[PDB]
RNA sequence: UUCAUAACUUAA
RNA sequence: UUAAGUUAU
């Protein structure tokens, strides 16, 4: 036994403590990226073919360097001889020693690798793409092995939470230099394979955490100088880790050395096209697909997603001041102006306006409107601003003083409160008590709420996985009608709303719609097809009842942005709201049996059904820019016949510069919005629905690809998993045959009912237990690496019995109620929410007797189903509202407000 | 503003709290 | 009784809004904190001690209300 | 007709804020560019003659605007006046660790380019 | 200072 | 169709 250990030591003199007992194989759980004729996926397997040998340094202390012996077949042993000999000169190849030891009577081949770390690059990727708190020993061991954090750092509660513990980003960033060194080693390894004429597939499990490669059992020798390394699955799986660990941080320093100071970039520099190309060639040299630094040169929406993904990573190196609107000097009437003639996007690269006039005789109303909405005119004339309250980029201060608007406490209705107390309410020991109030805020609320955008981080997505997901997501929206419409076909819900900055200083939205003729609106819409119009978004505090001390803010887009967006999206948005029985239930009424129909649709054909629901933490703030761009591309797929390739790009660029990374007009000062979604955007609810479906599909893809193929008993599912890996990482073109099959698979086992952010899923319970479909655990993992948030399981829910509906959907509970001769599902809210609305109002004018009676009828309609609740205290809430209606009429078809059968008709199946 | 002030004092007298009653008499 | 202190807290902060209390940042910042704590309070021990403290702010400046 | 009133008001707004634009500083910035196209985020950084600093607490005041003068954006700034959250004039000597609780934070600091 | 979308009720 | 109000995101 000692002789075998001596031969493992080899020529190098290093102490090697054994891991096995009798020089036998070692069994560990490791993540492997595997694809063969049987099994295809990225999951953990059993590695029982190696015999690790931990190295003992001076003073007998253990170090991070292992000796592994694989002892494969004799035929494979000779194959590794030729490949290693052609690659021993490459510094990126781990040292190999070949020897044969007499374990048995006969000669036994052995292959030994020297100085390998405990974990590979696949272990790091899997630990972060399949994160699970508690069961995260591998990630913790990796973090402390490379001095990212101390062993006691995990004693702190919620150490992994991005929101609760923002310092976790600093710990993860300590792995950036190690990851960047691995990227450089891979390029060196690929060059050696290409020069030696070696063809093979590079996988993460074959690369050490030091960047060394040690597996050559699947390489085929060819003519030297014509080697073809395959790095589709390698780079694509590693992409979310590049921005999580901030691998390219060293590129910001001089000579890419962290010790040296930062590069002093020229302050006027904005192009950075050559720098992006150099970065791509340095780290992604063998990425086969063409990369366009500027997305204006892309071929289709799929190419935009591919190229914008690389721009997200590369934009983290360039100075923040180089992004945003690009301005120049133009001469009109002899008076020079500063206007925006372009835009430098962090994702779309540099975009230049086409219709630019250096000299103009006069301004028509169309261009007069455009110049006013331009942030260039306002920001140039403002003063320099340095705000230390928030980490968001500050552009300028338009006003000589900072606004400190506050939130007033809500008004009280003493008449209703006395009546409720007189009727036996608000007593101690009762299950119904006030929990919703109009919480007050101080003068720092407006800027403190805006600072929540710090949760938005540059996220680089798995591009091969994302490109397949958008095909499945687009299937959910194939039953809709979309396209551009004329100005006279636009329907405006309310013209008495704010027109946004700076247009709110002269009139409401009614003034501008009346001032511009249909020709002017159409001309402005055609202008956005060739030019980018940056706008300014105003931030206002939301004065509404809530159960949380959190301040609410609403973003108000300018009239220029919302007018052109309506002509581009309203046809599709109206079609979505007018469709019944689809996955997206926006526009479906909950009255007249609509709630029952919605629940029956989601219960369609699931054989072993359980109900599941979740919520997105900081959804409007932590949404990655890649997913927001993806949502716009899906909505723009209905313009295949009305818009050209360039027209669709500029429309996307306009949205990215208006509701994604636009200027923010908060408290008299201009700021830069890192990303997320704007509440006041015309497509906010529908864009969030696309984002919701994408995460659900991504969770299902990850769940199926992370399960053991051998353990799957169903032949159809195993074949489905094998083709799923094949479509993501082996085919660059869309396989519509498989997209339909996967979409049909999701509709059968993962039927879901989705609104903007709330979602209810009726999934196959048996499949979920085997990992065949997504579950709560898969959603948490997806949100960790693709959304930069941690979703606690306490915030989600699971329902086992379908007799009672979803536990929580759109702030409504569900119960089965008999109605005449059949059982139906009726939505009822929290009794505290209903009572709080009546007790507290937001205006003293609303306290008037005439206004309350109309106000109380609507509340009684919502509170009517509470009468069917088994709890007697819940049922009395509607009776109290009914009785209060008598008193209002006492002191003031009319009788229809009581005799509650009027409210019965609001929930009967017939309309 | 007279109506709002006079109704608030009714609630304070209705609460019947020793600490609340102590300060209101001290200020009176 | 527990509902009454939150009931009285809302109106007590409301009357200070038009008394130009928010004109001073120091007074409004602590008044808002006291008022919000009563609404989120769950135990009756601490519910009163913000109630008496917040009312004392109104009596601090007599000019507002003629007692 | 509303066609003209909004046109006049919006045209006035464009012309009424040329005080800090087309000045001597802004001309130099454009010429150095190889095409005359520059990012918007750098114009206030190199052309504005007045800077506003919002200081939330005394700890940040020492590290940002200590003394009567300080440097920012590769330029020298001279502190002119300091006001509190109530827009009241605050003397420079009043800012201290002991007097910090008596100050109506945040503090707004106005400076002029040297 | 007070956004977007959807449903519903009320009154003309 | 216009106005107002409520709930919903
Ligand atoms: N413009 C508005 O007036 C507006 N109002 C809202 F309440 C919500 N949104 C949008 O929906 C998202 C999730 O809303 P969200 O915060 O989840 O709502 P909620 O707190 O009522 O939900 P829940 O009861 O399930 O917790 C918001 O981040 C925003 O994108 C709005 O645009
Ligand atoms: Mg291997
Ligand atoms: Mg949410
Ligand atoms: Mg929600
Ligand atoms: Zn491209
Ligand atoms: Zn179109």
Whether the Cβ atoms of residue A757 and residue A789 lie closer than 8 Å to each other: no
Closest CA to A762 of A619, A583, A576: A583
Whether the Cβ atoms of residue A160 and residue A790 lie closer than 8 Å to each other: yes
Residue ranges with strand state E in A19-82: 26-35, 40-50, 53-56, 62-69
Which of A757, A813, A833 maximizes ligand 1 atoms within 8 Å of its Cβ, making it the mutation to test the pocket?
Answer: A757
For chain C, the domain total comes to 1
Is A546 (CB) below 7 Å from strand E?
no
The residue assigned the tokens 């600490």 is B19
Rounded Cα gap, residues A668 and A214, in angstroms:
60
Q: Distance (Å) from CA A555 to C1' E3? A: 5
- What are the beta bridge partners of residue A822? A819
DSSP secondary structure string, A340-355?
EEEEEETTTEEEE-SS
Q: Is chain C in touch with chain D: ≥3 Cβ pairs within 8 A?
A: yes
Contacts of D50 (CB under 8 A, 6+ apart): A383, A384, D110, D111, D112, D113
How remote is the C-alpha of A824 from its chain's centroid? Answer: 36
CA angle A626, A648, A232 (to 5 degrees): 40
Bases of chain F within 7 A of a CB of the protein: 3-9
Joined tokens for residue A782: 């997806």
Contacts of D62 (CB under 8 A, 6+ apart): none
Q: Is residue A571 one of the residues assigned to a domain?
A: no
Peptide bond into A502 cis (omega under 30): yes
Closest CA to A448 of A392, A509, A494: A392
- What are the beta bridge partners of residue A352? A342
Rounded Cα gap, residues A505 and A502, in angstroms:
6
Domain boundary among A153, A175, A206: A206
Q: Distance (Å) from CA A378 to C1' F2? A: 37
Phi, psi of A34 (to 5 degrees): -120, 140
Quick one: A265 exposed, middle or buried, by C-beta within 10 A (0-12, 13-18, 19+)? middle
Joined tokens for residue A657: 């510069």
Whether the Cβ atoms of residue A406 and residue A445 lie closer than 8 Å to each other: yes
Distances (CA, A) of A190 to A218, A286, A287, A566, A729: 15, 7, 11, 50, 18
By alpha-carbon position, which residue is closest to atom 18 of ligand 1? A757
How much helix, strand and coil, in percent to the nearest 5, is found in chain A?
45, 20, 40
Q: Is residue A896 one of the residues assigned to a domain?
A: yes
Q: Distance (Å) from CA A500 to C1' E5? A: 18
Closest CA to A612 of A830, A793, A811, A470: A793
Tell me if A757 CB under 6 Å of ligand 1: yes
Joined tokens for residue A160: 């992994």
Phi, psi of A348 (to 5 degrees): -95, 0
Stretch (H or E) spanning A370: helix A365-373
Closest CA to A585 of A677, A689, A493: A689
Contacts of A596 (CB under 8 A, 6+ apart): A824, A825, A826, A909
Closest CA to A402 of D43, D79, D105: D105
Phi, psi of A46 (to 5 degrees): -105, 120
Task: Tell me the H-state helices in chain C.
Answer: 2-17, 25-40, 44-60
The gap between the terminal CA atoms of chain A, to the nearest Å, is 85
For chain A, the domain total comes to 2
How much helix, strand and coil, in percent to the nearest 5, is found in chain B?
85, 0, 15
Whether the Cβ atoms of residue A74 and residue A109 lie closer than 8 Å to each other: yes
Rounded Cα gap, residues A475 and A735, in angstroms:
13
Give how far A324 is from chain C: nearest CA, Å: 35
Whether the Cβ atoms of residue A438 and residue A413 lie closer than 8 Å to each other: no
The gap between the terminal CA atoms of chain C, to the nearest Å, is 25
Q: Is residue A127 one of the residues assigned to a domain?
A: yes
Rounded Cα gap, residues A145 and A448, in angstroms:
38
| Contacts of range A160-164, beta carbons closer than 8 Å, 24 or more positions apart | A160/A131, A160/A133, A160/A136, A160/A790, A161/A790, A162/A455, A162/A622, A162/A788, A162/A789, A162/A790, A163/A455, A163/A617, A163/A618, A163/A789, A163/A790, A164/A790
Rounded Cα gap, residues A474 and A697, in angstroms:
11
Ligand 2 being an ion, which residues bring their Cβ within 5 A of it?
A 205-206, 215
Minimum CA–C1' distance nucleotide for A498: E3
Handedness of CA A500, A501, A506, A512 (dihedral sign): negative
Contacts of A200 (CB under 8 A, 6+ apart): A193, A216, A218, A219, A220, A229, A230
Boundaries of domain holding A867: 813-904
Mode of pairing for the β-strands spanning A552-556 and A411-412 = unpaired
Joined tokens for residue A779: 């959603």
For residue D81, the tally of other CB atoms under 10 A from its CB is 12
How remote is the C-alpha of A460 from its chain's centroid? Answer: 10
- What are the beta bridge partners of residue A67? A53
Interchain CB contact of B14 with C (< 8 Å): yes
Joined tokens for residue D94: 């009043």
C2/A428 CB distance under 8 A = yes
Active-site annotation holds for A737:
no
The residue assigned the tokens 């009429």 is A889
Rounded Cα gap, residues A878 and A376, in angstroms:
55
Closest CA to A425 of A890, A885, A883: A883
Q: How many residues does the structure list for chain B?
A: 28
Rounded Cα gap, residues A357 and A495, in angstroms:
32
Q: Which chains form contacts with chain C, at 3 or more CB pairs under 8 Å?
A: A, B, D
Whether the Cβ atoms of residue A212 and residue A185 lie closer than 8 Å to each other: yes
Distances (CA, A) of A829 to A633, A797, D9: 36, 17, 48
Is A854 (CB) below 7 Å from strand E?
yes
Whether the Cβ atoms of residue A778 and residue A769 lie closer than 8 Å to each other: no
Closest CA to A611 of A436, A798, A796, A472: A798
The alpha carbon of A83 and the centre of ligand 2 are apart by a number of angstroms equal to: 15
Rounded Cα gap, residues A180 and A653, in angstroms:
31
Distances (CA, A) of A835 to A313, A426, A863: 50, 10, 9
The residue assigned the tokens 């069917």 is A868
CA angle A827, A828, A833 (to 5 degrees): 140
Judge whether A307 is annotated as a binding position: yes
Joined tokens for residue A107: 């000669």
- What are the beta bridge partners of residue A34? A41
Bases of chain E within 7 A of a CB of the protein: 1-11
For residue A492, the tally of other CB atoms under 10 A from its CB is 13
Is A812 (CB) below 7 Å from strand E?
no
Give the CA radius of gyration of chain C: 12
Joined tokens for residue D98: 């002991």
The residue assigned the tokens 């609106």 is A521
Joined tokens for residue A747: 């509709």
Q: Could you say which of C6, C32, C40 has the minimum Cβ distance to residue A442?
A: C32
- What are the beta bridge partners of residue A110? A99
Rounded Cα gap, residues A405 and A743, in angstroms:
49
Mode of pairing for the β-strands spanning A552-556 and A15-18 = unpaired
Q: How many residues does the structure list for chain D?
A: 114
Reduced to 3 states (helix: H, G, I; strand: E, B; else coil), residue B11 is helix
Report all structural domains of chain D as residue ranges with CATH numbers, in order of start: 25-114 (3.30.70.3540)
Whether the Cβ atoms of residue A730 and residue A805 lie closer than 8 Å to each other: no
Joined tokens for residue D14: 């464009």
- What are the beta bridge partners of residue A359? A331
Rounded Cα gap, residues D103 and A748, in angstroms:
64
Closest CA to A609 of A751, A822, A475: A751
How remote is the C-alpha of A640 from its chain's centroid? Answer: 26
Stretch (H or E) spanning A199: strand A198-201
Closest CA to A563 of A674, A656, A485, A628: A485
SS3 sequence, A549-570? CCCEEEEECCHHHHHHHHHHHH
Task: Tell me the H-state helices in D16-111.
Answer: 24-32, 43-47, 58-65
Furthest-apart CA atoms within chain A: distance in Å: 108
The residue assigned the tokens 């021990």 is C45
- What are the beta bridge partners of residue A213? A93, A207
Rounded Cα gap, residues A166 and A454, in angstroms:
10
Active-site annotation holds for A315:
no
How remote is the C-alpha of A838 from its chain's centroid? Answer: 38
Rounded Cα gap, residues A559 and A537, in angstroms:
10
How remote is the C-alpha of A658 from its chain's centroid? Answer: 19
For residue B1, the tally of other CB atoms under 10 A from its CB is 10
Rounded Cα gap, residues A694 and A728, in angstroms:
15
Q: Is residue A804 one of the residues assigned to a domain?
A: no
Q: Distance (Å) from CA A587 to C1' F3? A: 23
Reduced to 3 states (helix: H, G, I; strand: E, B; else coil), residue A289 is coil
Whether the Cβ atoms of residue A222 and residue A51 lie closer than 8 Å to each other: no
Q: Cα-Cα-Cα-Cα dihedral of A110, A116, A119, A123, to 10°? A: -80
- The tally of CA atoms less than 13 A away on the side-chain side of residue A804 is 13
Boundaries of domain holding C39: 1-67
Phi, psi of A230 (to 5 degrees): -105, 115
Q: Is chain B in touch with chain D: ≥3 Cβ pairs within 8 A?
A: no
The DSSP 8-state label assigned to residue A410 in this structure reads P
Closest C-chain CA to A417? C7
Rounded Cα gap, residues C43 and A591, in angstroms:
39
Whether the Cβ atoms of residue C37 and residue B2 lie closer than 8 Å to each other: no
Closest CA to C25 of D56, A408, D104: D104
Phi, psi of A811 (to 5 degrees): 60, 35
The residue assigned the tokens 């200070």 is C16
Relative to the CA of A757, which ligand 1 atom is closest? 13
Minimum CA–C1' distance nucleotide for A586: E6
Relative to the CA of A688, which ligand 1 atom is closest? 30
Whether the Cβ atoms of residue A560 and residue A369 lie closer than 8 Å to each other: yes
For residue A193, the tally of other CB atoms under 10 A from its CB is 26
The gap between the terminal CA atoms of chain B, to the nearest Å, is 20
For residue D8, the tally of other CB atoms under 10 A from its CB is 10
Active-site annotation holds for A575:
no
Joined tokens for residue A734: 């869309």
For residue D99, the tally of other CB atoms under 10 A from its CB is 11
DSSP secondary structure string, A507-543?
-BHHHHHHHS-HHHHHHHHHHTTTS----EEEEEEE-
Rounded Cα gap, residues D43 and D28, in angstroms:
11
Joined tokens for residue A510: 């009614």
Whether the Cβ atoms of residue A601 and residue A753 lie closer than 8 Å to each other: yes
Q: How was this structure determined?
A: cryo-EM
Rounded Cα gap, residues A781 and A772, in angstroms:
16
Is A578 (CB) below 7 Å from strand E?
yes
Mode of pairing for the β-strands spanning A198-201 and A229-230 = parallel
Closest CA to A401 of A390, A388, A385, A389: A385
Joined tokens for residue A30: 């490791």
Is A850 (CB) below 7 Å from strand F?
no
Which entry of A756, A765, A775, A781 is annotated as an active-site residue? A756
**What burial letters (b/e) apply to A879-910, b meaning 16+ CB within 10 Å?**
ebbbebbeebeeeeeeeebeeeeebeeebeee
Is A835 (CB) below 7 Å from strand F?
no
Joined tokens for residue A878: 């509607």
Resolution (A): 2.5
List, as ranges, residues 47-86 from D with C-beta within 8 Å of A. Answer: 47-56, 60, 64, 72-73, 83, 85
Closest CA to A33 of A226, A212, A218: A218
Q: Could you say which of A267, A340, A383 has the minimum Cβ distance to residue D40?
A: A340
Rounded Cα gap, residues A689 and A695, in angstroms:
10
For residue D19, the tally of other CB atoms under 10 A from its CB is 8
How remote is the C-alpha of A862 from its chain's centroid? Answer: 33
The DSSP 8-state label assigned to residue A409 in this structure reads P
The gap between the terminal CA atoms of chain D, to the nearest Å, is 49
Rounded Cα gap, residues A642 and C51, in angstroms:
64
Rounded Cα gap, residues A327 and A316, in angstroms:
22
Rounded Cα gap, residues A145 and A156, in angstroms:
19
The DSSP 8-state label assigned to residue A135 in this structure reads S
Whether the Cβ atoms of residue A796 and residue A612 lie closer than 8 Å to each other: yes
Joined tokens for residue A273: 């096209």
Ligand 3 being an ion, which residues bring their Cβ within 5 A of it?
A 615-616, 619, 757
Furthest-apart CA atoms within chain B: distance in Å: 27
Give how far C42 is from chain A: nearest CA, Å: 10
């Amino acid at each position: 036994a000692q002789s075998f250990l001596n031969r493992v030591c080899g020529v190098s003199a290093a102490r090697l403590t054994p891991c096995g007992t009798g020089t036998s194989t070692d069994v560990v759980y490791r993540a492997f990226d595997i694809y063969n004729d049987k099994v295809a996926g990225f999951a953990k397997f059993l590695k029982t073919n190696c015999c690790r040998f931990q190295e003992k340094d001076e003073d007998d202390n253990l170090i991070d360097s292992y000796f592994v012996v694989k002892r494969h077949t004799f035929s494979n042993y000779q194959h590794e001889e030729t490949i290693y000999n052609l690659l021993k000169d490459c510094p990126a190849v781990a040292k190999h020693d070949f020897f044969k030891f007499r374990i048995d009577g006969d000669m036994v081949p052995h292959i030994s690798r020297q100085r390998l770390t405990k974990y590979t690059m696949a272990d790091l990727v899997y630990a972060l793409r399949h994160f699970d708190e508690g069961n995260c020993d591998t990630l913790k061991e990796i973090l402390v092995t490379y001095n990212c954090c101390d062993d006691d750092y995990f004693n702190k509660k919620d150490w992994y939470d991005f929101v609760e513990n923002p310092d976790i980003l600093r710990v993860y960033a300590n792995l950036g230099e190690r990851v960047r060194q691995a990227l450089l080693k891979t390029v060196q390894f690929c060059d050696a394979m290409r020069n030696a004429g070696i063809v093979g597939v590079l996988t993460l499990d074959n690369q050490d955490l030091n960047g060394n490669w040690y597996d050559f059992g699947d390489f085929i020798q060819t003519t030297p100088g014509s080697g073809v390394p395959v790095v589709d699955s390698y780079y694509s799986l590693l992409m979310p880790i590049l921005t999580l660990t901030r691998a390219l941080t060293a590129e910001s320093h001089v000579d890419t050395d962290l010790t040296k100071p930062y590069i002093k970039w020229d302050l006027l520099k904005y192009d950075f096209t050559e720098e992006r190309l150099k970065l791509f060639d340095r780290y992604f040299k063998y990425w086969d697909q063409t990369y366009h630094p500027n997305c204006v040169n892309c071929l289709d929406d799929r190419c935009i997603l591919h190229c914008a993904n690389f721009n997200v990573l590369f934009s983290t190196v360039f100075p923040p001041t180089s992004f945003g609107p690009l301005v120049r000097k133009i001469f009109v009437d002899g008076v020079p102006f500063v206007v925006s003639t372009g835009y430098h996007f962090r994702e779309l690269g540099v975009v230049h306006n086409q219709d630019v006039n250096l000299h103009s005789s006069r301004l028509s109303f169309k261009e007069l409107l455009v110049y006013a909405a331009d942030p260039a005119m306002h920001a140039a004339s403002g003063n320099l601003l340095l705000d230390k309250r928030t980490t968001c980029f500050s552009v300028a201060a338009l006003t000589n003083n900072v606004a400190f608007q506050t939130v007033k406490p809500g008004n009280f209705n003493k008449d209703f409160y006395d009546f409720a107390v007189s009727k036996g309410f608000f007593k101690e020991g009762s299950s119904v008590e006030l929990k919703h109030f109009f919480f007050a805020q101080d003068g720092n609320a407006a800027i403190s709420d805006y600072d929540y955008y710090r949760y938005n981080l540059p996220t680089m997505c798995d591009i091969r996985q994302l490109l397949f997901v958008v095909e499945v997501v687009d299937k959910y929206f194939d039953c809709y009608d979309g396209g551009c419409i004329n100005a006279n076909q636009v329907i405006v819900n309310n013209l008495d709303k704010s027109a946004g900055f700076p247009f709110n200083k002269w009139g409401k939205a009614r003034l501008y719609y009346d001032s511009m003729s249909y020709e002017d609106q159409d001309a402005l819409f055609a202008y956005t097809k060739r030019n980018v119009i940056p706008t300014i978004t105003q931030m206002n505090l939301k004065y509404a009842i809530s159960a949380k001390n959190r301040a609410r803010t609403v973003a108000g887009v300018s009239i220029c942005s919302t007018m052109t967006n309506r002509q581009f999206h309203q046809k599709l948005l109206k079609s979505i709201a007018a469709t019944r029985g689809a996955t997206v239930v926006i526009g479906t009424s909950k009255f007249y049996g609509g709630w029952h129909n919605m629940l029956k649709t989601v219960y369609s054909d699931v054989e072993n059904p359980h109900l599941m629901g979740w919520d997105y933490p900081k959804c409007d703030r932590a949404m990655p820019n890649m997913l927001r761009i993806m949502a716009s591309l899906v909505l723009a797929r209905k313009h295949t016949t009305c818009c050209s390739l360039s027209h669709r790009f500029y429309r996307l660029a306009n949205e990215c510069a208006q509701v994604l990374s636009e200027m923010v007009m908060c408290g008299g000062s201009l700021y830069v919005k890192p990303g997320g979604t704007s509440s006041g955007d015309a497509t906010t609810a529908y864009a969030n629905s696309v984002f919701n479906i994408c995460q659900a599909v991504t969770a299902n893809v990850n769940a199926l690809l992370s399960t053991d193929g051998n353990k799957i008993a169903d032949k159809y599912v195993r074949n489905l998993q094998h083709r799923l890996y094949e479509c993501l990482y082996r085919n660059r073109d869309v396989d519509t045959d498989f997209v339909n099959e996967f979409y049909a698979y999701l509709r059968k086992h993962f039927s879901m009912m989705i609104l903007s952010d709330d979602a209810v899923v009726c999934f196959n319970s048996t499949y979920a237990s085997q990992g065949l479909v997504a579950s709560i655990k898969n959603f948490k993992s997806v949100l960790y690496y693709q959304n930069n948030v941690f979703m606690s399981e306490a915030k989600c829910w699971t329902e086992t019995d379908l007799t009672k509906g979803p536990h929580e959907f759109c702030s409504q509970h569900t119960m089965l109620v008999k109605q005449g001769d059949d059982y139906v599902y009726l939505p009822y809210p929290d009794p505290s929410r209903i009572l709080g609305a009546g007790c507290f109002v937001d205006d003293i004018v609303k306290t008037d007797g005439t206004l309350m009676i109309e106000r109380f009828v609507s509340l009684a309609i919502d509170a009517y189903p509470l009468t069917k609740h088994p709890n007697q205290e819940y049922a009395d809430v509607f009776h109290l509202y009914l009785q209060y209606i008598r008193k209002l009429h006492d002191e003031l078809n009319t009788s229809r407000y009581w005799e509650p059968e009027f409210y019965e008709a609001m929930y009967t199946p017939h309309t | 503003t007279s109506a709002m002030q006079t109704m608030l004092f009714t609630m304070l007298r209705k609460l019947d709290n020793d600490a609340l009653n102590n300060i209101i008499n001290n200020a009176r | 009784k527990m509902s009454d202190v939150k009931c009285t807290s809302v109106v007590l902060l409301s009357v200070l809004q038009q008394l130009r209390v928010e004109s001073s940042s120091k007074l409004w910042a602590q008044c808002v904190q006291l008022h919000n704590d009563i609404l989120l309070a769950k135990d009756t021990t601490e519910a009163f001690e913000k109630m008496v403290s917040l009312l004392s702010v109104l009596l601090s400046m007599q000019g507002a209300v003629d007692i | 007709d509303k066609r003209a009133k909004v046109t006049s008001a919006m045209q006035t707004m464009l012309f009424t804020m040329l005080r800090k634009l087309d000045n001597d500083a802004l001309n130099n910035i454009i010429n150095n560019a190889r095409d005359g196209c520059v990012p918007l985020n750098i114009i206030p950084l190199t052309t504005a003659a007045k800077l506003m600093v919002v200081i939330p607490d005394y700890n940040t005041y020492k590290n940002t605007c200590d003394g009567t003068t300080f440097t920012y954006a590769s330029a020298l700034w001279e502190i002119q006046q300091v006001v509190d959250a109530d827009s009241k004039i605050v003397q420079l000597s009043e800012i201290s660790m002991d007097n910090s609780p008596n100050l109506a934070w945040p503090l707004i600091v106005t400076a002029l380019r040297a």
